[PDB]
C-alpha cells in the first residue's frame, strides 16, 4: 500500500473507532476523538466552548450528528490551516 | 504524535514532494502522484484519459495548476468513496 493509502485508511478507521456501530458521532464523540487524536489543540485553545463551536459548523441541520463527510471537512480545514502555516513559516 | 497527526502530515508532505518549490501540481505531477500513490486504482479504470478527466474537475480556473485545497478535494473524493463502499460491504 502506499503512504497515501495508509493515511486514508487511518482517517477512515479513526472515524469508525469513535463512531461505534451507530456509524456517526455525537458531540460526546467529537470531544473524545479530538482529545485522543489532537492532544495539543483543544487544551491549548484557551476557550471552554471549543468543541461546541467546532460542531456548530459541522452540524447544519442541528441534529447532533456528525457523519463521515463532515468529519472529513473537519480534517480538511485543520490540514489546510497547517499547510498554510507550514508553507509560510517553515517550507 | 497521534495516528491522525501522522496521517495529516503524510498527506501534506505528499503534496510538497510532487509539487516541488513551485507549490502546485501540474497534470504531469498529478499523474506521477497517482501512479506512485494509488497504483491499483488508475490502471484498473480502463480509461486512458482518467487522469485528464480528474485534472478537469480540479482545474476550476483552467490554469493548469492544482493547489493544496484541490489536491485535498481529490483525496476527500476518494476517501469518502472508499468509506461508502466499506460501510456497505466490508464492516
Amino acid at each position: 500500500p502506499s503512504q497515501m493509502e495508509h493515511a486514508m485508511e487511518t482517517m477512515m478507521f479513526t472515524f469508525h473507532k469513535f463512531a461505534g456501530d451507530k456509524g456517526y458521532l455525537t458531540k460526546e464523540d467529537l470531544r473524545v476523538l479530538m482529545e485522543k487524536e489532537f492532544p495539543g489543540f483543544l487544551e491549548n485553545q484557551k476557550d471552554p466552548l471549543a468543541v461546541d463551536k467546532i460542531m456548530k459548523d459541522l452540524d447544519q441541520c442541528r441534529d447532533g450528528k456528525v457523519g463521515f463527510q463532515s468529519f472529513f471537512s473537519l480534517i480538511a480545514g485543520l490540514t489546510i490551516a497547517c499547510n498554510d502555516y507550514f508553507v509560510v513559516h517553515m517550507k | 504524535p497521534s495516528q491522525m497527526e501522522h496521517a495529516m502530515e503524510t498527506m501534506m508532505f505528499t503534496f510538497h514532494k510532487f509539487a516541488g518549490d513551485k507549490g502546485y501540481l501540474t497534470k504531469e505531477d498529478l499523474r506521477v502522484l497517482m501512479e506512485k500513490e494509488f497504483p491499483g486504482f488508475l490502471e484498473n479504470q480502463k480509461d486512458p484519459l482518467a487522469v485528464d478527466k480528474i485534472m478537469k474537475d480540479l482545474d476550476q480556473c483552467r490554469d493548469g495548476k492544482v493547489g493544496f485545497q484541490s489536491f485535498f478535494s481529490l483525496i476527500a473524493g476518494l476517501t469518502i468513496a472508499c468509506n461508502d463502499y466499506f460501510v456497505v460491504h466490508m464492516k
Binding site: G40, F41 | P1, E5, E9
Partner: peptide
C-alpha cells in the same frame, strides 16, 4: 511531529 507543533501554533 510537525503537524502536532503547527496545531499548537493554531492553539
Amino acid at each position: 511531529s510537525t503537524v502536532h507543533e503547527i496545531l499548537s501554533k493554531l492553539s
